[PDB]
Amino acid sequence: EVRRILPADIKREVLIKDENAETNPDWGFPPEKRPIEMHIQFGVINLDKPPGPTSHEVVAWIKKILNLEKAGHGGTLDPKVSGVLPVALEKATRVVQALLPAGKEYVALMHLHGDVPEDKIIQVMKEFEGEIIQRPPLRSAVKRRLRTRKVYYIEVLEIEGRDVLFRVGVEAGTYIRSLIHHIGLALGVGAHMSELRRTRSGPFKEDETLITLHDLVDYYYFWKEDGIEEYFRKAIQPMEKAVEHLPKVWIKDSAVAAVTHGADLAVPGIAKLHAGIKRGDLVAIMTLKDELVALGKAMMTSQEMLEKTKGIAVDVEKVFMPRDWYPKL
Amino acid sequence: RIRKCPKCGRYTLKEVCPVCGEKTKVAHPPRFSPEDPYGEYRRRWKREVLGI
Amino acid sequence: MKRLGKVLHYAKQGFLIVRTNWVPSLNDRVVDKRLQFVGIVKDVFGPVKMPYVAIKPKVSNPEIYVGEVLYVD
Numbered sequence: 001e002v003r004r005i006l007p008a009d010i011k012r013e014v015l016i017k018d019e020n021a022e023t024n025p026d027w028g029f030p031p032e033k034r035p036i037e038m039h040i041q042f043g044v045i046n047l048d049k050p051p052g053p054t055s056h057e058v059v060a061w062i063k064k065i066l067n068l069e070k071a072g073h074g075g076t077l078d079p080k081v082s083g084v085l086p087v088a089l090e091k092a093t094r095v096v097q098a099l100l101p102a103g104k105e106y107v108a109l110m111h112l113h114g115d116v117p118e119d120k121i122i123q124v125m126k127e128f129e130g131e132i133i134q135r136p137p138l139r140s141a142v143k144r145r146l147r148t149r150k151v152y153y154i155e156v157l158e159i160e161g162r163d164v165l166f167r168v169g170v171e172a173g174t175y176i177r178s179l180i181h182h183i184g185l186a187l188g189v190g191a192h193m194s195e196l197r198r199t200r201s202g203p204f205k206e207d208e209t210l211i212t213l214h215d216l217v218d219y220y221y222f223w224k225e226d227g228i229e230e231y232f233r234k235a236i237q238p239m240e241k242a243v244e245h246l247p248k249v250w251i252k253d254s255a256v257a258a259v260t261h262g263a264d265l266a267v268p269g270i271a272k273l274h275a276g277i278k279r280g281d282l283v284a285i286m287t288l289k290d291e292l293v294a295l296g297k298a299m300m301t302s303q304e305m306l307e308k309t310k311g312i313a314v315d316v317e318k319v320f321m322p323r324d325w326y327p328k329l
Numbered sequence: 330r331i332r333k334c335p336k337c338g339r340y341t342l343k344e345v346c347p348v349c350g351e352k353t354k355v356a357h358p359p360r361f362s363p364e365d366p367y368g369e370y371r372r373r374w375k376r377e378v379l380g381i
Numbered sequence: 382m383k384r385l386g387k388v389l390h391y392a393k394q395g396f397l398i399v400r401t402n403w404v405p406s407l408n409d410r411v412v413d414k415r416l417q418f419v420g421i422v423k424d425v426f427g428p429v430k431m432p433y434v435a436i437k438p439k440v441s442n443p444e445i446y447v448g449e450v451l452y453v454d
């Protein structure tokens with residue numbers, strides 16, 4: 001509990017509504033049960049975007065290379081920017097809804113226009129931690145009103161000449177470029193962002209799952225030409241990964257069948273859920289086997305979902321799970 | 330130019346990592362073109378290393 | 382008027398920077414204690430608790446107002 005780390009790092013408590021709910025082993029397709037074909041249908045790539053193309057351009061390349069019909073990315077990265085670019089595929093394409101508003105982390109290089117003592121650089125940068133005022137750019141919105149945004153943390157890494165390398169964690173909508181420009185004004189001499197790379201976007205970060213377009217295509221070829229599935233399979237994360245940072249509600253089988261058949265999530269359909277859910281919050285609706293069923297907006301707080309006997313706990317906005325997994329109404 | 334060390338992934342501007350002394354590399358991945366020239370060559374050695 | 386002034390410096394990029402504990406508005410008129418008018422607010426930033434303000438100098442020669450308290454009428 002503190003604006004000092006990325007919210008995705010904060011663990012939530014699991015409240016239990018119904019302790020005896022059980023799940024049928026015959027129903028559903030947990031990640032470790034999905035054939036490669038199906039894994040792709042409900043997959044998300046943790047792509048290391050290269051500097052150069054626009055993110056849209058990158059998605060287009062991927063749609064072509066993998067012969068896909070649908071794909072989408074979870075957080076626009078400017079052309080010169082590299083880094084984590086989650087790319088959801090086919091039936092999972094809309095899970096980006098859960099990523100676009102997630103917290104982000106970057107490693108940025110600021111170029112000062114004058115000589116300033118290190119201590120003053122560190123001092124002034126520590127001032128930009130927390131809720132700050134940052135008006136949107138000239139490109140976004142038709143109402144350039146100044147709003148606030150959270151900078152979860154700013155950590156200066158190295159200082160060479162007038163070049164300042166630093167790591168920064170922020171809530172969606174925070175422009176690193178503006179942040180650095182403002183720091184320049186605060187220091188008087190001025191500054192601009194010379195380089196930028198994203199190291200975290202929601203639950204996606206720089207780990208073994210981060211893969212480049214070169215690796216992607218090659219692993220693809222290994223699967224298509226040599227019949228090797230292991231590499232391409234690992235290059236694709238199951239959609240469930242794209243929802244790891246979201247508060248969840250685990251529902252009974254009958255509730256899963258109801259939701260995958262157009263109904264909303266009923267309060268009595270909840271077996272257990274995360275605490276801290278507030279009305280209006282985006283929540284991941286999960287199966288008792290941890291499969292993603294849908295994304296929705298919370299109609300009540302965790303405490304209400306926990307104690308209530310009836311009504312709608314969550315308004316379903318998008319269903320990912322096919323109707324044949326968990327059959328009947 | 331932003332760099333990072335292959336081991337311990339520390340980010341730095343220095344050629345050699347201040348933490349482990351091992352050499353660092355530009356953090357950005359190589360440029361990509363859908364035409365992917367040399368893709369065949371790359372896969373030839375890659376199949377070898379992986380054992381495909 | 383609304384105080385919270387005292388210019389920290391004249392940023393090389395052409396703006397008067399002032400620290401404050403209140404968030405003013407854009408295009409707000411800025412004046413000295415003599416109501417001479419220095420310029421107009423062009424940007425507000427930094428922490429919401431103690432923000433920085435960039436006054437677009439509209440005087441023949443700024444830099445003199447550094448260390449000088451500024452107000453908003």
Ligand SMILES: [Zn+2]
Nearest residue numbers: 334337346349
């Ligand atoms: Zn190292």
